[PDB]
Design a protein around this ligand. Structure first.
Ligand SMILES: OC[C@H]1O[C@@H](O)[C@H](O)[C@@H](O)[C@H]1O
Ligand SMILES: OC[C@H]1O[C@@H](O)[C@H](O)[C@@H](O)[C@H]1O
Ligand SMILES: [Zn+2]
Lengths: 688, 687
């Protein structure tokens, strides 16, 4: 679609948007003036409202009431505050689920999903779609050409709860999805391997979604499962498009977005694909507690930018402190509030918003942090939040808008479909999923002072000096060609275990692994060597000769090309048949460029190997560990203005080479004329 | 309205001592040996027919009493009283087969089938009909039979069937809400149903909290709280109906039902049920390991608490192993007698076991009894006979109707707060209310102080000191009670996770503790949960006095000017916790408030207690030995004092001898100077 960013309200300029989900309909209206006074003081200029306000709008069937929403929207507009307005179709009222219990989702075992939480609806319910499009229309009509509304928030995190439906509506939809994608039943049969275990289909009507097949010790069809995960994503996407189609039909000036859930571990929605149906990309992200906090946020924001194809994106949600939804919910430390928002910013967001504005007293999210805590305006959270708005106006005025995150030296390929494939319960080990490997390489590259671009698989990683292929389990013929070309012409590639095992339908490649691509990699593998502690005396690690250690899984490399060089070998009990086998290799292919990594090494084993491997490939690398102490993230204007952010990645005070330019921002950090000083959780930004 | 069961025609008053008794599982030719062996053991009551429904109403509407008459006659002739059940605990196969609509449904709509017990819907009109009929039939048939000294109505209501989601549950829960709230808006307002489009147009839209999709999903916290309240109230209404039918036909016979008070029990509101029984009776089974002693003393204290210090009846406990855990350990030598003495010392006037004769078959076949499968030549039967003897001695020494003395400190227990801390969207699933009171009780025991565990509506505000441990719900009134208690000179220990929400689970605003910050002197803007969920997570916080907080800590932002800080957190500065306040004490008029800003554990509390108490002005022996023996004291109106001493340790201990006559000793040695207890020993004196 074409890129349409939300624009300012009639009269004032373009700013970094800074706001929050806002839910006045959970408080007495008399609170709305205080809300707005405190927003202004904070630097807040947009809020998103009505996201789950369905049952306070269509108060009963066919009956729409807009007064309370009309009143508060008026107060916000008069205050200079924009409205990112929802469809309010995210979750239905009790009256509707009562009259039509047929809209309720069904899990793999046919359990009914009742109301009492949210999103208890079947994505492909014809009835739910009807009520829903009606509300979308009603809303669009009523706020047509109301000028406070600068954009639409259609629904809410589609599929967060209702990805997997197994109801009769879903059965019907998965059938037709399969007909539309495969054409003939023979082709479905051939993609799924249905001659195995007498699963062969006589017709499209015989096809079932992968409902319960009896638990542990039972193994559902993997190809059918892969496709079903694909269908689920597309079913929700289709629903979204029908809703957006209705909203811009009535108010075509207003750009539409929906809020994604990009994080290192998200493993449902195919968001690179969804991104093709939004005027701008916006994301919800919540910090991962502990050591992974920083690298995993950077990773996710980088990825978002990747899906955005380096266009500006909108951080719709993140948290000021604790979430509510983990089994343990830690608070943020001093500085992390500001520093996290800065990271999202540095990775290309032109907007920064939280869930939520005012902490709820009751309901299931009552313990989720907000900008204004229950403790009230005399709280450290609110003080930090005010500081943030202030820094975001500063950045706006220095002119950062619409600058793009710069092109890294190395692309790290992330691939959701591979993630799905690696999820089957009959793989060589359940201890290996695709999602962790890209994250480790990103963390490892941060350790050596190189900030990578996380890039989805259909993006242009083949225009980078180097790419990481980390457990890209599905390799199609085309994917194989793309990598072969990238390497022929001087590309340098890092390829790992669990890469290129199967075609795109989860049919394993023959003649040895990596499949399709073995000529380029220079390595041949006849089987895996999974490792663990399931049973007493099991082989549970493999030492590597460079002083690292592999866990969970290793490849058994049988032969290498004559021009393949071994950098590292496994060191083990000879009887294991792994002693002296190749663990890390590098192999020339024309002008490039391939290192193969035959096991899971983790952030730190990757990171400790990285120097010897980069040297072998001709990738310049700082070999000093200090090099990773600060993470440097850069945005570039076409006019040549450069915004460089520095972040302490460690738990001790650090000193960095000061960039040239003007200091725009500082949190837990000290500028000097020579060198720059950051405390833990501290951030700096300069314009050059 | 306290009615204790009385002796049979002719007998004197004795500590009751018996067991569940189930002759309907054996050939009648075994009964004379049962009774014989009972007499040798000192047994003077049995409870029978508790699950004998299918052997009484053998088929629909057919009631048969001959076997029960025969055995009750042998028992009567032998001098053994009968605590007779309604036998309505669990229905026959013919009933559930004819009427499968009585069957419970779990949150996912699963039928709960027969094959175990208590598979019934609490609010099944059909089942209620059958049960109340049987109740009547029993009552009719044993009207004015002098063998029957009491009624055992049903059995452990809600042990299995607390949570029903059937249509009967759906309907009753509506009506329960209609009645508790009046108008649908008061509901909407209690539950915060404007969040996530939950707002209700009517009562007919209210549903019980059935499955909303497992992990990653979060049901309405107020609706869940109230549903837990409802589940307890539904079973209670049912019990009252059963007892009403019984006491109407035989009004002279006192009625009870058996509770399951233990540290971690978390369903029935028992303090609330205690209002519908003629005497309070409890089932308790030991917690294996270290916690064996303190967790029994705590549970028994709490039952007395619920009884408002009136005598209570230990209906069930075990001689050795239970059957129902994943590992079922046996009791060690001495624990059988010592355990019964702990319950006695905490105010019980009856001591009975599950069960009399170990079963050869059925699901409880490996559950221990008084007469083991090994037979009469067993260590368990030998100890039982000794216990029987000890209890006759104590009856003769005049212990009956003595009350447990008023301790210096009350420890507040609150089932409704436990229900609240159970919701899956709290700061951490690692914190529940129940553990904390238990830690403080154990902690005082470590310092030679025996506390009274008290439910929230009991009179803790008449003690020198009260403990408020994870009392997450504070109503306005609760807040006023505490304020008054401290103003008028009471001293209070308050912890983290206290006073977060009103009674509807709605968070207090303006900072925590809510409502009560004027009295506590501390202001908290958010929590700092700790754990190991993810690598590098903050998983503990040292405290400056040498203890350690785990699981959860409060972030104390400000303290009142007259607040004194006793200990601070010590952390990595980047955490924003280093040097923060961890234990504080604060004057409020004539009391009296110490704040403990995290989970310390038994040992952390115990190690801090001296300093806290000194600052509060509560005398405390600073020596660790002080907790080597637990002293529990019962007092007669006439001035008689019964003092029991118990070894809490695993090595021999020596204590000051009480004055008076020595009544009982197990694994212990009276001397004229000082007393000697072995591991697991108990001693008793009258003074
Ligand atoms: O952390 C909680 C938040 O998670 C967001 O992704 C969701 O869209 C918000 O409504 C809120 O639920
Ligand atoms: O410990 C085993 C016992 O548990 C009791 O609570 C129950 O009422 C008895 O019948 C038996 O099941
Ligand atoms: Zn089920």
């Amino acid at each position: 679609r074409a890129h349409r960013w939300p624009q300012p309200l009639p009269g004032n300029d373009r700013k970094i948007w800074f706001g929050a989900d806002y839910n006045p309909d959970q408080w007495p209206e008399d609170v709305q003036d205080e809300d707005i006074r405190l927003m202004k003081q904070a630097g807040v200029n947009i809020v998103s409202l009505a996201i789950f306000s369905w049952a306070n709008i269509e108060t009963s069937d066919g009956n729409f009431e807009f007064d309370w929403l009309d009143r508060v929207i008026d107060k916000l507009y008069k205050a200079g505050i924009a409205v990112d307005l929802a469809s309010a179709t995210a979750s239905p009222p009790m009256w509707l689920t009562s009259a039509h219990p047929e809209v309720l989702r069904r899990d793999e075992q046919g359990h009914v999903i009742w109301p009492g939480a949210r999103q208890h609806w079947r994505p492909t319910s014809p009835t739910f779609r009807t009520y829903a499009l009606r509300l979308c229309r009603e809303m669009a009509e009523h706020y047509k050409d109301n000028p406070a509304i600068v954009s639409w928030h259609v629904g809410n995190e589609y599929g967060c709860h209702n990805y997997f439906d197994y109801s009769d509506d879903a059965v019907q939809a998965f059938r037709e999805w399969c007909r539309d994608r495969y054409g003939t039943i023979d082709k479905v049969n051939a993609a799924w391997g249905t001659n195995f275990w007498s699963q062969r289909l006589n017709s499209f009507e015989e096809i079932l979604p992968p409902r319960y097949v009896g638990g542990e010790g039972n193994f559902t069809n993997p190809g059918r499962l892969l496709d079903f995960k694909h269908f689920c994503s597309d079913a929700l996407k289709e629903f979204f498009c029908a809703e957006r189609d209705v909203l811009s039909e009535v108010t075509p000036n207003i750009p539409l977005t929906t809020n994604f859930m990009v994080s290192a571990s998200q493993n449902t929605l195919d968001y690179d694909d969804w991104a093709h149906e939004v005027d701008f990309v916006s994301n919800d992200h919540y910090f991962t507690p502990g050591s992974w906090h920083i690298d995993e946020l950077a990773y996710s924001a980088s990825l978002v930018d990747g899906i955005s194809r380096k266009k500006p994106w909108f951080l719709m949600e993140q948290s000021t402190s604790a979430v509510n939804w983990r089994e343990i919910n830690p608070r943020k430390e001093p500085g992390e509030l500001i520093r996290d928002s800065m990271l999202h910013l540095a990775m290309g967001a032109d907007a920064i918003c939280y869930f939520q504005w005012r902490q709820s007293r009751s309901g299931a999210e009552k313990f989720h942090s907000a900008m204004l805590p229950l403790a009230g305006e005399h709280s450290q959270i609110y003080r930090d939040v005010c500081a943030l708005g202030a820094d975001l106006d500063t950045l706006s005025d220095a002119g950062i808008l619409r600058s793009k995150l710069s092109k890294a030296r190395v692309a790290i390929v992330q691939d959701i479909q591979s993630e799905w494939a690696t999820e089957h319960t009959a793989t060589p080990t359940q201890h290996i999923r695709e999602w962790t490997e890209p994250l480790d390489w990103f963390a490892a590259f941060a350790n050596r002072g190189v900030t990578a671009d996380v890039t989805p698989i259909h993006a242009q990683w083949d225009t980078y000096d180097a790419v990481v292929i980390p457990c890209v389990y599905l390799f199609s013929e085309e994917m194989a060609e793309r990598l072969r070309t990238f390497v022929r012409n001087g590309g340098k590639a890092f390829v790992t275990y669990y890469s290129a095992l199967a075609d795109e339908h989860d049919r394993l490649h023959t003649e040895g692994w990596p499949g399709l691509i073995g000529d380029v990699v220079g390595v041949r593998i006849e089987e895996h060597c999974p490792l663990g502690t399931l049973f007493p005396g099991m082989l549970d690690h493999l030492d590597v000769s460079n002083g690292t250690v592999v866990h969970d899984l290793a490849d058994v490399i049988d032969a290498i090309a004559d021009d393949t060089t071994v950098l590292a070998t496994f060191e083990a009990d000879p009887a294991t048949g792994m002693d002296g086998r190749a663990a890390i290799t590098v192999h020339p292919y024309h002008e490039g460029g391939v290192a193969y990594i035959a096991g899971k090494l983790g952030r730190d084993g990757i990171s400790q190997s990285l120097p010897e491997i980069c040297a072998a490939l001709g990738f310049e690398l700082d070999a000093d560990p200090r090099a990773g102490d600060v993470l440097r993230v850069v945005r570039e204007q076409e006019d040549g203005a450069i915004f460089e952010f520095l972040f302490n990645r460690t738990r001790n005070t650090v000193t960095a080479d000061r960039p040239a330019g003007d200091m725009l921002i500082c949190s837990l950090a000290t500028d000097s004329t020579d060198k720059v000083t950051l405390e833990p959780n501290g951030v700096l930004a300069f314009r050059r």
